[PDB]
């Protein structure tokens, strides 16, 4: 039952993340960072696709899915610079990584080899995501040390 639970909760986690990304895109769009806004919107969609992935596997493997409330994103209250937004997104992915590792540990305890196999590509994708977001946040933080310079690279990049 704990495994089935954690599986169900990973869907919520992916959908929660989707909404957080959407919130980041709104913040960026409202503050005229259209390039960062596009990035966040695309990633919102990707997180939804992850959750649907979990759903589909669950259905095939007879793991009951019950859809939970997708909480309101509330880090957009705190956000006052692009740096704040990217820092929250990095924490969000760090948590998504932790939630997948916990799920895998439950599967491992249960000898659920199909669930572990299913999760392998996600483990590796999370490594790539954390690295990419990490690297973006480092660039944002460095470029923002000179007034207007960050803007100058929402244009160029993204």
Specify the residue, 91 or 101, whose C-beta has the smaller distance to its own copies: 101
79, 85 in Cβ contact below 8 A? yes
| Residue 110 touching its own copies (CB under 8 A) | no
Half-sphere exposure in the Cβ direction for 75 (13 Å, CA): 23
Binding mask 31-70 for its own copies (x = CB under 8 A): xx-x------x------x---x--xxx-xxx--xxxxxxx
* Residue 50 and residue 123 in contact, taking contact as beta carbons nearer than 8 Å: no
Does position 84 interact with its own copies (CB under 8 A)? The reply is: no
Which of 35, 1, 21 minimizes the C-alpha distance to 157?
A: 35
Which of residues 4 and 26 has its CB atom nearest to its own copies in the complex? Answer: 26
- Residue 36 beta carbon to its own copies: minimum distance, rounded to whole angstroms: 12
- Is the separation of the CB atoms in 17 and 90 below 8 Å? no
Based on the shown chain and the rule CB under 8 A, indicate whether residue 86 belongs to the binding site for its own copies. Answer: no
Q: Nearest approach, Cβ of 18 to its own copies (angstroms)?
A: 9
90 lies in the site for its own copies, by CB under 8 A: no
Closest CA to 92 of 62, 125, 124, 133: 133
């Amino acid at each position: 039952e704990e495994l089935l639970d954690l599986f169900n909760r990973q869907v919520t986690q992916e959908f929660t993340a989707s909404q957080v990304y959407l919130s980041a895109s709104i913040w960026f769009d409202q503050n005229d960072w259209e390039g960062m806004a596009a990035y966040m919107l695309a990633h919102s969609a990707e997180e939804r696709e992850h959750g649907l992935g979990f759903v589909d596997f669950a259905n095939k493997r007879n793991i009951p899915i019950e859809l939970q409330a997708v909480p309101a994103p509330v880090s957009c209250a705190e956000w006052s610079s692009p740096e704040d937004v990217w820092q929250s997104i990095l924490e969000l992915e760090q948590a998504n990584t932790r939630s997948l590792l916990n799920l895998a540990e439950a599967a491992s305890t249960c000898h659920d080899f199909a669930v572990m196999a299913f999760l392998n590509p996600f483990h590796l994708q999370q490594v790539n995501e954390e690295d990419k977001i990490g690297s973006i946040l480092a660039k944002v933080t460095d470029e923002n040390r000179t007034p207007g310079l960050l803007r100058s690279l929402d244009v160029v990049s993204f």
